Amino acid sequence: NMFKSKHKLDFSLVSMDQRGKHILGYDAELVNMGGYDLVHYDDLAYVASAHQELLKTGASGMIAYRYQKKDGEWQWLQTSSRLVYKNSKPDFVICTHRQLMDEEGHDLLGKR
Ligand SMILES: O=c1cc(-c2ccccc2)oc2c1ccc1ccccc12
């Protein structure tokens, strides 16, 4: 139930596992989709704090949030993020996701 993806430092998508493409339901549309565009409104500030924590410390722990698929439906995801460096400089973002059920996302939502 877990899949990986790679993003630029603005979290625009670069590549994604074929497992994740089947869940999200979007390859041609993957490069046109910048960051924070398909994240739920109630999660944008919390999700942006993980982006700040990623750039500040180099890693972001598992956080639960809602992402919109192609069908318009919201998907509960929990993602851990790590940085890839090019000579000590941050280069890309590597994310590890896990597809969650609605009850699983609600339980992790109540932990923050
Ligand atoms: O909306 C972006 C896309 C993605 C994303 C996730 C799964 C599939 C495709 C894009 O997630 C994030 C985004 C931006 C900031 C994030 C911070 C922490 C964790 C995830 C973030």
What residue spans define the domains of the chain? Answer: 1-112
Around ligand 1, the residues with Cβ closer than 6 Å are 5, 11, 13, 24, 35-36, 39, 47, 50-51, 60, 67, 77, 79, 81, 97
Contact indicator for 66, 76 with CB cutoff of 8 Å: yes
Residues 6+ apart with CB under 8 A from 25: 69, 70, 71
Contact indicator for 6, 92 with CB cutoff of 8 Å: yes
Contact indicator for 49, 55 with CB cutoff of 8 Å: no
- The experimental method, as deposited, was X-ray
Does residue 105 come out as left (phi exceeding 0), alpha (psi in the -120 to 50 range) or beta? Answer: alpha
- Return the closest-CA partner of residue 64 out of 3, 31, 112: 112
Q: Which of 3, 47, 78 for a ligand 1 pocket mutation test, highest count of atoms within 8 Å of Cβ?
A: 47
Which DSSP state fits 39?
A: B
Rounded Cα gap, residues 47 and 25, in angstroms: 22
Nearest CA, atom 21, ligand 1: 47
Does residue 83 come out as left (phi exceeding 0), alpha (psi in the -120 to 50 range) or beta? Answer: beta
Residue in the block written with tokens 């993020």: 81
Rounded Cα gap, residues 109 and 35, in angstroms: 21
- The residues with which 66 forms a beta bridge, in sequence order, are 76
- Resolution of the structure, angstroms: 2.4
- Strands ordered across the beta sheet of 59-68: 13-16, 2-7, 89-99, 74-86, 59-68
